[PDB]
Amino acid sequence: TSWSDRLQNAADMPANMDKHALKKYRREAYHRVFVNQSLAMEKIKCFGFNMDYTLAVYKSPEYESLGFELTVERLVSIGYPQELLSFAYDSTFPTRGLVFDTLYGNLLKVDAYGNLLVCAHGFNFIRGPETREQYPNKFIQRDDTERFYILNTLFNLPETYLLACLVDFFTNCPRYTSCETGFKDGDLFMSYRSMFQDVRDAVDWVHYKGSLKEKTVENLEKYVVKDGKLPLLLSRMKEVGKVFLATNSDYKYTDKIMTYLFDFPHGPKPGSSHRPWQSYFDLILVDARKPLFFGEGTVLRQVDTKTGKLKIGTYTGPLQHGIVYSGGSSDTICDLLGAKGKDILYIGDHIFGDILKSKKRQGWRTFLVIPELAQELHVWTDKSSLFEELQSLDIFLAELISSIQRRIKKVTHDMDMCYGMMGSLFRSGSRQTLFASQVMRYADLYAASFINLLYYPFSYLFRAAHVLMPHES
Amino acid sequence: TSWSDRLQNAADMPANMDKHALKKYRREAYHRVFVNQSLAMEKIKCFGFNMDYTLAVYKSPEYESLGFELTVERLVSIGYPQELLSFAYDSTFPTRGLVFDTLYGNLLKVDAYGNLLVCAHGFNFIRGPETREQYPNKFIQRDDTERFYILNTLFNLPETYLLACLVDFFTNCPRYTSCETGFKDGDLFMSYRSMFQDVRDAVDWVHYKGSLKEKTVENLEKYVVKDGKLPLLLSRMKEVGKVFLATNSDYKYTDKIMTYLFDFPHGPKPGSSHRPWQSYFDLILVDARKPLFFGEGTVLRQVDTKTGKLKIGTYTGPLQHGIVYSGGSSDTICDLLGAKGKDILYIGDHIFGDILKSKKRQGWRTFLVIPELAQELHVWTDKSSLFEELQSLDIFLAELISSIQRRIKKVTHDMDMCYGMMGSLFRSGSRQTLFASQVMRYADLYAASFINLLYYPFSYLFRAAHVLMPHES
Amino acid sequence: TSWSDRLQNAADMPANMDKHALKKYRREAYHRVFVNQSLAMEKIKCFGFNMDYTLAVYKSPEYESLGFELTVERLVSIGYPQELLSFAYDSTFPTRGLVFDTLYGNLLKVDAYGNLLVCAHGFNFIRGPETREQYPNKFIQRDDTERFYILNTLFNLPETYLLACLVDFFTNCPRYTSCETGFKDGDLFMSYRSMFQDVRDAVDWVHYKGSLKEKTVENLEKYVVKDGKLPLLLSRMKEVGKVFLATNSDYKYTDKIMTYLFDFPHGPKPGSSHRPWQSYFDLILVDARKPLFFGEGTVLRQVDTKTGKLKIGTYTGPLQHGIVYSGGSSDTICDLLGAKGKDILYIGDHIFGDILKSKKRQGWRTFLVIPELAQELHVWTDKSSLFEELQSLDIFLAELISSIQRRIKKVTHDMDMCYGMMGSLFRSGSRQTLFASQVMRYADLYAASFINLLYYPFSYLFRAAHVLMPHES
Amino acid sequence: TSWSDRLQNAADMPANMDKHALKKYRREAYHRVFVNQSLAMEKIKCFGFNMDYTLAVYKSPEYESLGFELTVERLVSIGYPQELLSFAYDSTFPTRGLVFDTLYGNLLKVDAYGNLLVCAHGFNFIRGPETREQYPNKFIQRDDTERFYILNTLFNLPETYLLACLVDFFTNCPRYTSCETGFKDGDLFMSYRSMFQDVRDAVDWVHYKGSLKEKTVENLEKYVVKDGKLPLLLSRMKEVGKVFLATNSDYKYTDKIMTYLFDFPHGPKPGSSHRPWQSYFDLILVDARKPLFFGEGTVLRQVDTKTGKLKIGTYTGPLQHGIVYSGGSSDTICDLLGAKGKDILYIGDHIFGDILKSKKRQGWRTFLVIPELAQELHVWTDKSSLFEELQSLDIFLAELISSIQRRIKKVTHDMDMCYGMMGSLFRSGSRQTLFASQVMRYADLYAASFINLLYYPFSYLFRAAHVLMPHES
Ligand SMILES: Nc1ncnc2c1ncn2[C@@H]1O[C@H](COP(=O)(O)OP(=O)(O)OP(=O)(O)O)[C@@H](O)[C@H]1O
């Protein structure tokens, strides 16, 4: 039972729009919209979306496996050993948001202050005292961006597992001598950095030059979550404001995916005429290149919607029905729709490129879609006993014979393993992750699916608990 | 009654070291050490200090006025109008941590997300709807560092008031035509940016080339808080670990100030032999150049303690008794004292250069000294009624005829004016400031004076409330 | 009669190696090696080559036309108008070494001090007084590299003509409104900069992703000059030193071209066994990435000569027979062959990336191959009368009724048109070009073909006239 | 007999303005204007000057000794050993234009291609074979600007000698251990780089904060060459165009020096009323900050000529009589005087900041003043026998028993020593220096004094020999 299965079970259900059924529905956590900063919806005038893993949630683990197979094939085709072809993606290992250390070849799970919480070299999890040789302060300098790559998105889920497989394969293959910073193959040296780069380059190649998009479109029911409540919610959004799409995908792919997402024998509700997906949007912008999009951006261009290619030159005209933009910046959207930042609720999945940057660079309101949260919420309500036992041991230990500290590390471990081999997305025991930090800080609203917005009336006031400093209480 | 008066009233009292008197004393808030992240003191092996506004708290407003007089004189001496000589520092206007906007010449008080909370052009406070011409989203891009300067330190207190005086003087002096971005003087244009720079340059000149240090030393009782509990606390720190000084001042000035700070007819306790201040330190490092200090730093040099000048060349020797260092980096301290980051409790006043950078760059534990907090704590406990009335109106308004929203803005204003014309350091009404945000995030411990550490036993476990995400509860 | 026809007439002749026949042969200018700085060949220990337009001179204009056809097709395939397909490369317009001004869309021919010598907008040559609107000082800032691109190589010959065709087509096509900095197509704007970029990008794409290499290999006799004196000269070079190849091409293409260049029924001389081309080289390095090659370079890699792909990782081994390198730096060559800079004679065609950078960055001796010089030499000896008449008018005008200055500009024009519509490579009348300047400065030796080195004994002392300052004479 | 003595002998003579006396006078080389690029004076509309070592030639060696004494004193005052006070400037060692290598502490004399011509470590001149340990190719990468500083100006004459003295003192003082890259003083290390910096910083301090300007003004007849032909030439320049001053000095110092330069009991000719120096100028600009001046420059300011301080703000007004500018750019001059680049003859002494940059960045015509050339010209005409003997041996050696090559190196050495211990400014034997290269390339006209322009009629056509490539002849 994967997180994408819960989303597709809830998607197969028709919208009960009775005012009482909505209140009762959003009482359950799997359908709630969770609040980090107060937000009054009657001040929202423009609703903004990205596509990949927001409108178009790719089914798990089929989509991560397809990415893993295709990336592995690319690496073999440029000269990596045939033993990669015998790997096989294991959705139980990787958790989203890990840091790969290109110096020593480890996956690290860190809190916001760069403290180590989990460290795995290949498939070998390194315990507290043994990490101190490489991490003398149990700490990483997050600013050292040449050394530490954060794997933020669900596209990074294959490479997260792939990076372990590779370290594990070379570590234990006798053709290679393991060194501190990589692998000697006789007279060739492959550093963990250059290996990381080869993986990284390959994933890029698979998305942009390879067969990933091709193979997704040819079996969309295997790969993309489809929900007939999506036309309904967007149509209700356009009744009270403007709806725009700002995606990093190209128009050809966006068209195929959106068409599928809207292919029903009806419009917003059952029994209405089916409309084309573009008619649900006041502004459709592709090739967004976020997060540069929220700074100076790129030259603004016009898509030839018949051929799918860009017209030649910079677009200088007005917003007209059925025009489609490529590139540009976030200001392009604000000028054309005549909106200020806090007018906009931008709905996205990239904690950094979608959410943080729009918040910090433009003052946009942010809604972060967290697909894994549909499963994680279940695990959390079925093991509330282990976390509650953890909160109790933390409290008793404070009142204090350190045989307690070893029962804490054990309960920690068992709680963590329920989510995966790399723990929960948001914490390792009582200690929160960098991801969790960035959600709380930069995401006003968050949820397992944005479709949860449908169960809230369009005047609602999302409330957040006021923050008080220590001395202020 | 200034914040520096409370600190000097509490400094004139001898240390009652009875185990019960200490518990009872730190029950009052003016003597508490406030906790943002749990910290176990038995893991602290090195105690680190900066000098200015930590060990050497300059008395207010005498020190801010001396800085204001000296800066004003410098500006007149390089060609500014004689009317500056008739200004006079007003400690009731400036609050620490404001942002000066060099484009439009305003002082802004902002939250962590760059939202405007107060905007004053000169001495004219601009209300909500009128700021929207210049701040269409009520927002500033904090990343635009050419436009927005944060006034972080209490040395910035004179310039904070001086910048208003100048905008107010030119705005209302008929020799000058006020423009959007500065002042026309016939055929000369002075932009708010170049004016800001002239002020900025002048303050620097006063500290490094002018008479500020000279005039401080010649009347230390007028200017520096002195406390006989300081020798005691440092001597107790050296009983359980190592004590180092990392200050940005030069050795000559550090020597004069520290000598004064330790001039008593006794040592740590009454009746003991007086020791020189240097003997309270395992490592004394001047000319620190923070925050670059926490990165690559500067070349490490040796001070000639007799002449006060640097020896020629880079120091390459070991730590010996009575050696004094200039420059270097934070690694210089860790190697020589043989300490890891989380071993160190660095005590400082610069939220950015002392606290943030050591936390984020090196994993150091941080203690932030907030001198204003001695007065602010009083104002807060004597007007708890207005804040509690504010929390109530915020709650009732949520249950909701918007005549409530105007009683909120009025109570906000009256609460704020109790702290100054620019509000409290930590909030404007229910909304917290960027400073408050950075304290909670990067300062493990904070207090009005570090001497509050003396009232805690050296095994204490400072505890912080665990943070839970919305869905986690 | 193109420059590549003279080279192939002289290539079809067998080497007369009689000591007297060589002296007499190199008396004619078409076979001379021309000297800019004295060079003693007995001090040369390593001979270095690049491939494209040095070892492998592509026949003209067939190769420039193939590049022009392929580039034009690419531009139409990404959305440029169908009228490009009716263009047709005209080898009489472009001269090598022009500057394209991306601001105003002109091809300029400039001297070393950035003085305009010819300015053509499209196919319209702009006269002296009319250029002063756009070029008020008849001058360009060569340091402004965003504005001015120098077309240095014979690969730039198609784009040189293509850039005119495009300006001429849009200028005179009524669908487009000509502006100062580009072309309005209703609501799209194509600046001369973005147009230049589109051309530039296309040429790159044709070489690296398109069909240019493919179509060259399938008809090498149409495209590549072949000479049986090349095996002989290289074999004589290896008798007195070391020979290395440092080319920017990949191994697959290098192999196909070199194989052809050496496909004869014999070795160095007629009647000897044929050897493979690799055996003429002590070190074979591909993927050179010059001119970065002469700085820090790139990671050094090893080619799998069977598959043609790079092995995985950085090469760390020694120079062994039959190893082939990819990337690296110029130091890689010096260490492995144990040579100092002035030991090396590097033979190349890129005045900047081959010649200047090796001279200025590493002290290498330089030999520049100038293919056009085979035809240019002819034009020069058949019109020596017009240049001599120009030198006379320049002298008489100095003795001086400015009806002389108009006979000078007329003789200038007629002399120039003999070389092309864009004049000679080295001068426009009495005034030398930037190219000519850079040859004299950075090329020790130069010639129409490096094969001219065969007619000099391997002890020869190339002599250059000593330079005297004005006051020194 | 120093170069400044010849200039002051020729300055003490009144101008014979008879048309025949001028022709005959400029037949001698000490009064000629030497030509590198043809220049027609009737096209010159604006004459531009810098002050230091152009208008105000500081007498030698008194001014270099005053700089050497003052710099040495500064270094002792910041902690350098007392033995410096016993140094004493020796005008026979340093030649202008040397390169100091901050890695190995050597003064190098190099040609344009970075070839070593002389290498002295301290006062020890290193011969050919011994430099190959540190300079394996007898070559330096001129682009490595962190390692190699060019000493371009006559202000660099003291530091040139001072750098040798220091290397020589530490090398042979037994308190210090000489290392490859500097000097160990027990536990302090002084690298040649940091030593170079200390010298460099000190020279700056002496000019800007020290007593050099003060002590020059108090004895101008000891320090500044004065000539009554200077008012005459400038007055003749203003009869046929515009005259502007663009100097890097401040207004106070410029005023004192210019006043002296013009203090005579008469105006341009004897018997005319004396005018103030400012009246000889259409535009007077101080604080020029060249060579940035020829790029984006600095903010343009206005000098208060009464107080000598800058007014506050950016100047925005027109050119009016008696206004004086500070900062700005070269465009400021062209706009205000309404001149194109090739209208301007800029007269200066900085081969790089005055001459090269104006030529390459703005197309300005350049006149380089070379004070040493007054003596050097004498040495050259009195030893023409040794150079002519050198040209003969170079020719005979080409016809060739290498006992010739050792007579060449000996004649080279004896010719060189006539100019100084560091050879002539322009060559070492038959090989020209980088300086000589940059003069020929970027200086249209050059001379020992610009006053030599007075002996040429204001219509003159300076002619230069046309350059022909090898194959073109
Ligand atoms: N999730 C992320 N993915 C990629 N880059 C990131 C992410 N979060 C932060 N960064 C970038 O990494 C760099 C280093 O992070 P650093 O901790 O120095 O700043 P920061 O993230 O703003 O700090 P904090 O979040 O603790 O306030 C910054 O340039 C930041 O923009």
Ligand SMILES: Nc1ncnc2c1ncn2[C@@H]1O[C@H](COP(=O)(O)OP(=O)(O)OP(=O)(O)O)[C@@H](O)[C@H]1O
């Ligand atoms: N108090 C301060 N004083 C000076 N500079 C600061 C201060 N706080 C942050 N900065 C710097 O200002 C720049 C812009 O701030 P930005 O908001 O982009 O990052 P940030 O402060 O890390 O963000 P946040 O604190 O919201 O996570 C950054 O380079 C940051 O280091």
Ligand SMILES: Nc1ncnc2c1ncn2[C@@H]1O[C@H](COP(=O)(O)OP(=O)(O)OP(=O)(O)O)[C@@H](O)[C@H]1O
């Ligand atoms: N043929 C060329 N192709 C491309 N770039 C060049 C060429 N020649 C010079 N450049 C580069 O163009 C830039 C600007 O040229 P600039 O005239 O400022 O320097 P330069 O060429 O060394 O000058 P000069 O050759 O007149 O001494 C420099 O970075 C230089 O390296």
Ligand SMILES: Nc1ncnc2c1ncn2[C@@H]1O[C@H](COP(=O)(O)OP(=O)(O)OP(=O)(O)O)[C@@H](O)[C@H]1O
């Ligand atoms: N006399 C000088 N003083 C200081 N810097 C110089 C001088 N001459 C050149 N430079 C600078 O030194 C740097 C390195 O010189 P480099 O030889 O790479 O270029 P260049 O001087 O233009 O070359 P060339 O003069 O041989 O054409 C360049 O940035 C150049 O501007």
